[PDB]
Amino acid sequence: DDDFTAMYKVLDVVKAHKDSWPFLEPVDESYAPNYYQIIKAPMDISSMEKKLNGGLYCTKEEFVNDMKTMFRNCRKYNGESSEYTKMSDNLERCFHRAMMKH
């Protein structure tokens, strides 16, 4: 198969994970005060989906980088001890297994 199909299958697996729900859409600032003042490059699963379906991921590289940002942003904003960060770790290990499979 090809890189598109692989990335599509990976996102589907990631979205299905029990802890994906905080990462599905862009962060609502009413739930997270000054998120966009703190986070310079916001990233979420729906934006990755938009880029993928829009033919904007030429290679797996820029896909991994966006994933890397989504998790970096979580850690940065919520802290290492946050419940969101535990979920982020779980989702990261999920993204990793999926990459290895697809």
Please tell me the total number of residues recorded for the chain in this structure: 102
- As measured in angstroms, the least distance from the Cβ of 2 to ligand 96V is 18
Q: Shortest approach of ligand 96V to residue 17 CB, angstroms?
A: 12
What is the three-class DSSP state of 45?
A: helix
AA identity, residue 10: V
Rounded least distance, CB 64 to a copy of itself, Å: 5
Q: Does 91 bind ligand 96V (CB under 6 A)?
A: no
Q: Which of 2, 28, 40, 59 binds ligand 96V (CB under 6 A)?
A: 28
The answer to whether residues 70 and 44 touch, using CB atoms and an 8 Å cutoff, is yes
Residue 90, binding choice from a copy of itself, ligand 96V, none, Cβ under 5 to 8 Å by partner class: none
Alpha-carbon span 71 to 40, nearest angstrom = 13
